[model samples]
Target: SYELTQPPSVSVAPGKTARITCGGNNIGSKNVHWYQQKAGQAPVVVVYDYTDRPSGSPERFSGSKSGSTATLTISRVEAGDEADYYCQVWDSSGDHVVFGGGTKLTVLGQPKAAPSVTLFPPSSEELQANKATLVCLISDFYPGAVTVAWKADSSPVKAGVETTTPSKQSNNKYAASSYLSLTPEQWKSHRSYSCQVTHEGSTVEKTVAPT
Candidate 1:
């Protein structure tokens, strides 16, 4: 695993441009990649291996270089664009991954009043329930946007649950929350579940019921 960060931490508003430059002192000739993370959702790879795009990927992401700095650019931003952006380099010698320090992007504009996930109905210590609700909260954010997904073990999550991103609070910070209803039988059977948050240029993640 790698840790990535970006400077200038916050952005002005939607449609305003933001740039995150990645530097790896020892990247050598290894390939570098970029990913976009929206709150409560999985990370999406935008640019890879120094500008190579994965199959079926969109064109919104572009990669370029000048000297030792590699840049990832997102043009004509949208509310969905507010998430943590990451820069990663593949280590040739160690066959490992190197991530830059992540940057948290804050969209500047009229604060959207969104609901943030504060606590799960069943506390972490509470006994299991047949239909448990997994909650996530984000407070003081603009444009109040987030995506929450539930994955069983390492496999992708099945669809049918409702994912919501509510309005923002007074401080111009939006609070977004999500709920995942699952039975205790299903939870215990699965190896793990991951909660991923993407805001600005930094990604925050947590896992439950690890194998």
Candidate 2:
């Protein structure tokens, strides 16, 4: 049995990035692999044998090496990125797959502000026949240039109805706001909406419901 474990762990503020490195001794293999899975989906192989992909994989997952340490970097970490990451290897002797103890990524820091929606009438929760504007605000962030996205229900916000703006903050940080507009009918049936922000390589999200 190969016993695997992670380091003491570290904390990263919301919108800031952090990395966890897997280390092993006596595992004389040049290839390190990584995989991710949500609550119920099958585990998706993100990195293979240190830096290659197995086809039909996204480019967002990347790997690199430094001395004996192999690294898997997840860029623009989102709430969906919060999950278990594991290191794996192929054991030729046993002709089997081996995995390291899983590492849990914790997303820290609070969303700058709760999400808000402006009803067309400014007070009608029922989007019966008006347009509504959804605004998500992140008041503080580092390295700026955050990636913002809007989601209606669980799917992406409809196209042709979104925009973003960024402003500089002290200490090489920035603040940003994202907007999404929809017709009253869309809001009435959309159920709920959410806004996600990715900054400093980390992600934070806020959601609002029609009320």
Candidate 3:
């Protein structure tokens, strides 16, 4: 069981420092060990026996305790240091081990990149079959979040729209796709359709029309 609590996540830039605190009852009275878990890998000890730094541990990582809390401080953070940090302590009363909620450390080194958007209208074959599908592709965005909306001739279109969660790309960027389904009759009724993507307080739009 986790008796200690920690913040959900901390985001810092490269060369900056990150401090994570674990809070629990009488946590400072016990020895606390800190571990770091990278993606798809097992956790390794970063700090051992309260404030002792293990051999081979980098000098940038250190631990300290005061009052009812224990802290793990990372100085001069690097992109390779991005991982989940966990604190463990022995429970004297329960005679068991208690871990703290993991805190994710995000090292942001890349500048924010706006998404490149493209909208594609349904094929002629689909239109002939009385069904139309519109696709909106959002690619190469940083920070991995975007809100999508659809408009038909300046009117908002809410129904029959689906947007996927952002996916990480090979270049460490993000991509997302949104789909709008409609009857061919509805598609033909509109002179223009727009796909709107809002990222970082700005919107980018792409429009398509039936020919």
Candidate 4:
């Protein structure tokens, strides 16, 4: 097993450079690589082989290693470049790969915004299983973190709410979905169903009055 960690986050303004740091146990060997992942896309290699970059990659991106620490540098960071970064290294066996927890980089200057949320009410098919489900779809939020809550009428509904880890979208933003499950009786008698979202200190509420 490999263990690695990066700082929780770093904020860099436009035209400024930022350094994302990484360190780990059982990960001192070469063949170290770094990948850049936006809020919702596949990770792309930004640096590999100690410092060599792949063709067509941005010249401003680079990587380096010293002793046990590995670092990725981004020069003149831009909004589109805002994303999460991860470091990886090989163990002594040279076959096992260990990955570091990601560092979230936020490019400042863009105004913080609330997430767009949509609520989906449960259907008959779902109720047939003695279950009622409410889906909350949140998207396009910046800063990469958010909270969700469910309510029945004006009271809080804490049980049976499952929210996924936020995912990065191709637009360099984020998306997350939450589901609220209830018994058919509770669903049928519900007066109101609501999904509440919080992002960057801003709150947005959406509701559906299902039958």
Query: All models: lDDT?
Result: 0.59, 0.58, 0.86, 0.78
What tens-digit string does per-residue lDDT give for candidate 1 at 90-136? Answer: 66556777777665555556743333334343344533434555665
Candidate 4 has its poorest 10 consecutive residues by lDDT at 48-57
For candidate 2, what is the TM-score? Answer: 0.42
The segments of candidate 3 whose C-alpha lies over 4 angstroms from its true place after superposition are: 50-56, 112-167, 170-211
TM-scores, one per candidate: 0.47, 0.42, 0.54, 0.53
Per-residue lDDT for 71-123 in model 2, tens only? 66666566566666787776666577777766556455444332222212213
Model 3 global lDDT (CA atoms, 0 to 1): 0.86
Question: Which prediction has more favorable TM-score, 1 or 4?
Answer: 4
User: What ranges in model 4 sit over 4 Å off?
Assistant: 6-11, 26-31, 37-44, 51-58, 64-69, 101-106, 114-129, 137-140, 144-175, 180-211
lDDT of 4: 0.78
Best by lDDT: 3
**Candidate 1 off by > 4 Å:** 1-5, 26-28, 50-57, 111-171, 174-211
lDDT of 3 by residue, 94-180 (tens): 789888878777687677888999999999999898899999999998766678999868889989799997778999988999999
By TM-score, the better pick of 2 and 3 is: 3
Q: lDDT of model 3 at residue 120?
A: 97
TM-score of 1: 0.47
RMSD of each: 10.5, 13.0, 8.5, 7.0
User: Where does candidate 2 have its weakest 10-residue lDDT segment?
Assistant: 113-122
For model 1 the local lDDT of residue 191 reads 71
By TM-score, the best candidate is: 3
Instruction: Please state the error at residue 154 of candidate 3 in Å.
Output: 32
lDDT of 4 by residue, 146-203 (tens): 7788885778888879998777798877799999988888877878988999775578
